[PDB]
Design a protein around this motif. Structure first.
Motif, PDB file in Angstrom:
ATOM      1  N   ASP A  31       0.826  -1.201   0.000  1.00 53.77           N
ATOM      2  CA  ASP A  31       0.000   0.000   0.000  1.00 53.77           C
ATOM      3  C   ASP A  31       0.863   1.254   0.000  1.00 53.77           C
ATOM      4  OD1 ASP A  31      -2.352  -1.476  -0.053  1.00 53.77           O
ATOM      5  OD2 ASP A  31      -2.457  -1.607   2.139  1.00 53.77           O
ATOM      6  N   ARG A  34       1.305   1.669  -3.446  1.00 57.20           N
ATOM      7  CA  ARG A  34       0.121   2.312  -4.023  1.00 57.20           C
ATOM      8  C   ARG A  34       0.161   3.827  -3.860  1.00 57.20           C
ATOM      9  NH1 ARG A  34      -5.112  -1.224  -1.956  1.00 57.20           N
ATOM     10  NH2 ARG A  34      -4.618  -3.211  -2.989  1.00 57.20           N
ATOM     11  N   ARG A  80       1.367  -8.124  -8.736  1.00 58.11           N
ATOM     12  CA  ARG A  80      -0.037  -8.032  -9.129  1.00 58.11           C
ATOM     13  C   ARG A  80      -0.524  -6.588  -9.164  1.00 58.11           C
ATOM     14  NH1 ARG A  80      -2.683 -13.129  -5.762  1.00 58.11           N
ATOM     15  NH2 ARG A  80      -1.835 -14.773  -7.112  1.00 58.11           N
ATOM     16  N   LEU A  81       0.061  -5.721  -8.337  1.00 51.86           N
ATOM     17  CA  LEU A  81      -0.282  -4.308  -8.419  1.00 51.86           C
ATOM     18  C   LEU A  81       0.337  -3.664  -9.651  1.00 51.86           C
ATOM     19  CD1 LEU A  81       0.013  -3.031  -4.751  1.00 51.86           C
ATOM     20  CD2 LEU A  81      -2.045  -3.752  -5.972  1.00 51.86           C
TER      21      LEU A  81
ATOM     22  N   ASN B  15      -9.648  -1.155   3.650  1.00 52.52           N
ATOM     23  CA  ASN B  15      -8.503  -1.764   2.984  1.00 52.52           C
ATOM     24  C   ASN B  15      -8.038  -3.006   3.731  1.00 52.52           C
ATOM     25  OD1 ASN B  15      -5.691  -0.134   1.261  1.00 52.52           O
ATOM     26  ND2 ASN B  15      -6.678  -2.130   0.981  1.00 52.52           N
ATOM     27  N   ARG B  46     -10.660   0.446  -2.601  1.00 48.77           N
ATOM     28  CA  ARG B  46      -9.760  -0.023  -3.648  1.00 48.77           C
ATOM     29  C   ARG B  46     -10.299  -1.310  -4.252  1.00 48.77           C
ATOM     30  N   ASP B  48      -8.659  -3.210  -6.298  1.00 50.70           N
ATOM     31  CA  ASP B  48      -7.555  -4.121  -6.565  1.00 50.70           C
ATOM     32  C   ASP B  48      -7.205  -4.995  -5.365  1.00 50.70           C
ATOM     33  N   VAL B  49      -8.169  -5.278  -4.496  1.00 49.07           N
ATOM     34  CA  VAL B  49      -7.963  -6.228  -3.412  1.00 49.07           C
ATOM     35  C   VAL B  49      -7.999  -7.641  -3.974  1.00 49.07           C
ATOM     36  N   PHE B  50      -7.356  -8.567  -3.270  1.00 48.38           N
ATOM     37  CA  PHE B  50      -7.317  -9.958  -3.690  1.00 48.38           C
ATOM     38  C   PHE B  50      -7.462 -10.859  -2.478  1.00 48.38           C
ATOM     39  CE2 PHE B  50      -4.982  -7.797  -7.084  1.00 48.38           C
ATOM     40  CZ  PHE B  50      -5.643  -8.284  -8.195  1.00 48.38           C
ATOM     41  N   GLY B  54      -6.637 -15.443  -4.923  1.00 48.51           N
ATOM     42  CA  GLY B  54      -6.234 -14.529  -5.975  1.00 48.51           C
ATOM     43  C   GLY B  54      -7.376 -13.928  -6.758  1.00 48.51           C
TER      44      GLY B  54
END
Lengths: 274, 182
Positions: A31, A34, A80-81, B15, B46, B48-50, B54
């Motif tokens: 983060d 990010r 992955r980010l 988050n 957000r 883009d959390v996983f 996955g």
């Protein structure tokens, strides 16, 4: 945040030519990465390191984007980010050393990043570097076995040359990783495969120690009469046979299609080189 | 009401992940509370959390098949063609679970790639024929893809249709006869 009030947050040249987003992308935490994506333009391809670099085998890399370092230290969530960011650039990804982040995954094990990148791009199995090497070369010559298993699993041309004609079995034999050579021989590459000076696998397996790689490759097919005229190969075979109780010279005689010709003529090559 | 009495740490609430690895975007998009998804994305959580598998909210909402939840995600700059641990895209799950309006919504409305391979190198036409959903495969062939693209076991699609013995799906790939794969 407090330093984000003042600093430009992409600075470093002294003792490391990089950005804080490289360091944040390198050691993990995501983060922070990010927030630095919201503050820094996220793909900068930094610099040459000055004095003393990090990264071990990469003693100097010029222009590593922070996708590379997250691909390097393992950092799979950061991968992955950065595969979902504004400037991704997984394809081009050029360095002055020439690498691509699949190869930087090959420098370690880091098989999760390999799954992420080959799942993402898949036009990267056949991506050659500036020196013409593929990922199978680097995974071979660093000896990560299951990395080679996955890299054949996605499907790569095993008999693939560099700019100097190196098959990855030449690099695996030169580095002497035995089980990598067993994997490439057992499901692939031909040992009778030259180089752009005129070589084979057993020339590298003899040129730097490695008795067991030499006996495995020596059990395979090879042209002996092309090998005995290479006097450096004859000398290095003498050197390895000196250390290993002269079993491998016996093996090079007994494998050859005419063992008496090889023993006799090669003994004359010994006496002339004396 | 909970989202009034916190100035910024709302995001610190949004988050965090569950034991599974879920954010309330993953749970709300997993259930389909559409106005709640409009509430969470207006409160800028957000996307883009996983999870531990996955997966993103497109994979959960595409797994349960909700149109306006995925529409609300893609208005909030969600990333289609994301992949799971199996490498499954949202088109793979929508083709797996029979949501033709979601398939038309992804491919038509948002230009999702048709021939996405899994980690087992599977296009969603025979991952769709794995669960054996006839009209979904009618839609994918109506949109067109590489039919005989082999999988990790070298599987042309009627092989995977025959492993789970769906006869009508083989009647689709063979009655239409586009590839002569008898």
């Amino acid at each position: 945040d407090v330093l984000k009030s003042t600093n430009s947050l992409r600075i470093n040249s002294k003792k490391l030519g990089l950005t804080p987003l490289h360091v944040a992308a390198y050691y993990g935490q995501a983060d922070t990465v990010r927030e630095l994506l919201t503050s820094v333009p996220a793909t900068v391809k930094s610099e040459t390191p000055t004095g003393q670099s990090l990264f071990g085998d990469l003693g100097t890399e010029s222009g590593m984007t922070p996708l590379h370092l997250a691909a390097f230290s393992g950092n799979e969530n950061v991968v992955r980010l950065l595969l979902n960011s504004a400037g991704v650039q997984v394809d081009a990804a050029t360095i002055e050393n020439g690498y691509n982040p699949l190869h930087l995954a090959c420098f370690g094990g880091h098989m999760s990043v390999v799954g992420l990148l080959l799942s993402r791009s898949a036009e990267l199995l056949q991506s050659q570097d500036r020196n013409g090497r593929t990922g199978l070369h680097i995974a071979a010559m660093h000896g990560h076995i299951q990395m080679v298993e996955i890299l054949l699993g996605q499907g790569a041309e095993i008999n693939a040359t560099d700019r100097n004609g190196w098959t990855p079995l030449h690099c695996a034999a030169k580095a002497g990783h035995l089980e990598v050579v067993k994997l490439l021989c057992e499901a692939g590459a031909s040992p009778k495969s030259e180089t752009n000076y005129g070589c084979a696998a057993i020339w590298f397996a003899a040129s730097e120690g490695h008795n067991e790689v030499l006996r495995y490759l020596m059990n395979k097919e090879h042209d002996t009469y092309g090998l005995m005229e290479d006097k450096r190969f004859v000398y290095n075979l003498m050197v390895v046979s000196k250390n290993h109780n002269n079993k491998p010279i016996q093996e090079f005689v007994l494998v050859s299609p005419a063992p008496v010709d090889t023993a006799a003529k090669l003994s004359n090559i010994y006496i002339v080189l004396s | 009401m909970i989202s009034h009495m916190n100035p910024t740490d709302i995001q610190k609430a949004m988050n965090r992940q569950s034991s599974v690895g879920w954010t309330p975007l993953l749970i709300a998009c997993h259930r389909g509370h559409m106005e709640l998804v409009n509430n969470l994305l207006a409160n800028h959580a957000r996307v883009d959390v996983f999870d531990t598998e996955g997966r993103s909210a497109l994979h959960l909402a595409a797994e349960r098949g909700y149109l306006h939840v995925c529409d609300a995600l893609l208005t909030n700059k969600a990333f289609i063609n994301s992949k799971s641990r199996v490498g499954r895209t949202a088109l793979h799950l929508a083709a797996m679970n029979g949501f033709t309006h979601l398939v038309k919504f992804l491919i038509k409305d948002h230009n999702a790639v048709i021939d996405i391979l899994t980690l087992r190198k599977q296009t969603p036409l025979h991952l769709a024929a794995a669960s054996g959903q006839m009209e979904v495969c009618q839609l994918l062939l109506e949109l067109g893809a590489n039919i005989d693209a082999t999988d990790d076991l070298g599987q042309k699609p009627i092989h995977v249709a025959a492993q789970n013995n769906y006869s009508e799906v083989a009647k689709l790939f063979l009655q239409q006869h586009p590839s002569l794969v008898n």
